[PDB]
């Protein structure tokens, strides 16, 4: 028994509608400033951004923004290097336990494939992040819990992370809770499928090529098969 | 193989060259009537099982929902 | 046109030759065309 998030008219939903790629930019900013404290986008590395919403040199900037220490050192057991383009996004709470420790024993699931891993993810995400409504009568959530009608059980350890004007969009687009939930749902979506745009272009070329090739192959088949389909049989007993 | 497949007699068989015949002669001219002719001869054998599958599927869904519905008398 | 058949299709090799050349050029056009169509389709939502 769970609330089933409604269908939102997500822009990228269109058959050939690519991800905004402008919105995503905003969404990430949302992940970097809010969601990165607990969740880990393990499978998305700074380099990944280049080509989607940040240019090579631009990405280099962000990469350097954070610091990454690698153990291998000549004598030391580590060396700290500002993140390089190749470095993957920095996961907090190195061990999950760390996370559990501080998150009431609730592991913030990596939001790398969250949209793909959650049924109706894009919607779910939006709903969950925006579904932090009032608990009803009779409900008795355990210590360190909150009420969201969508989350399985309606008892998500995660406290509501998006308060209107939680962060300021560099683009200046008003940072309303929603504008922020929609941006982070687009971004998480992108994260779970960086190729969304490239694919849809392949699908458009595939539809054009099949629309060219199916009637022509049908015409070749009907040529070769016309011979028989016109064959007239006659029985002429002597 | 061919030549030893079967024995027929006095069955003449005329035919035409592909390039000498139109590609889709009377295609939609008779195709539609025929497709419709065909659908009639098979619709009563095919369709009513899938119709009652649709009724059973809907029924199951609705029944399940009602099942999930809270007894008014529950906890009162 | 008979010319086409007489010159391009009559010789099987030419039949292939024309196909070959056509293929060499089809990609260019189709790619660019579809690309732009796609670009227009998603005119505003892209990296740019």
């Amino acid at each position: 028994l769970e609330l089933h998030p409604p269908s939102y008219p997500w822009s990228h939903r269109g058959l050939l509608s690519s991800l905004d790629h402008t919105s995503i930019r905003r969404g990430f900013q949302v992940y970097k400033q809010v969601c990165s404290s607990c969740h880990s986008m393990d499978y998305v590395a700074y380099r990944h951004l280049v080509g989607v919403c940040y240019t090579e040199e631009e990405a280099k900037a962000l990469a350097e923004e954070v610091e990454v220490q690698d153990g291998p050192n000549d004598d030391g057991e580590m060396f700290m290097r500002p993140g390089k383009l190749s470095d993957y996004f920095p996961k907090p709470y190195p061990n999950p336990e760390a996370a559990r420790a501080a998150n009431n024993g609730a592991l913030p699931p990596d939001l790398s494939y969250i949209v793909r891993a959650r049924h109706g993810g894009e919607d779910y995400v939006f709903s969950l992040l925006t579904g932090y409504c009032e608990p009803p009568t009779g409900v008795s959530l355990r210590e360190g819990l909150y009420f969201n009608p969508y989350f399985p059980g309606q008892a998500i350890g995660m406290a509501p992370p998006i308060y209107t004007e939680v962060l300021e969009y560099d683009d200046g687009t008003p940072a309303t809770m929603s504008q922020v939930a929609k941006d982070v749902a687009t971004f998480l979506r992108w994260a779970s499928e960086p190729e969304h745009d490239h694919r849809k272009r392949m699908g458009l070329k595939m539809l054009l090529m099949m629309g060219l090739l199916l009637p022509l192959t049908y015409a070749m088949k009907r040529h070769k098969w016309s011979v028989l389909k016109s064959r007239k049989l006659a029985y002429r007993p002597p | 193989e061919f030549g030893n497949l079967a024995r027929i007699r006095h069955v003449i068989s005329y035919s035409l060259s592909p390039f000498e015949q139109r590609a889709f002669p009377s295609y939609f001219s008779k195709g539609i009537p025929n497709v419709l002719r065909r659908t009639r001869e098979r619709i009563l054998r095919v369709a009513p099982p899938f119709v009652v599958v649709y009724l059973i599927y809907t029924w199951g869904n609705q029944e399940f929902e009602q099942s999930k519905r809270k007894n008014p008398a529950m906890y009162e | 046109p008979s010319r086409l058949y007489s010159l391009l299709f009559r010789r099987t090799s030419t039949f292939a030759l024309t196909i070959a050349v056509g293929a060499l050029f089809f990609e260019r056009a189709f790619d660019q065309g579809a690309d732009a169509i796609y670009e227009h389709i998603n005119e505003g939502k892209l990296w740019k």
Partner: peptide
């Protein structure tokens, strides 16, 4: 015998001749 009948009329199927041979 053979002459009893003529090739059935394929006109319905026949399209609308070397002049047209290449064309076809």
């Amino acid at each position: 015998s053979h002459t009893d009948v003529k090739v059935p009329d394929f006109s319905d199927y026949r399209r609308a001749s070397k002049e047209s041979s290449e064309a076809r």
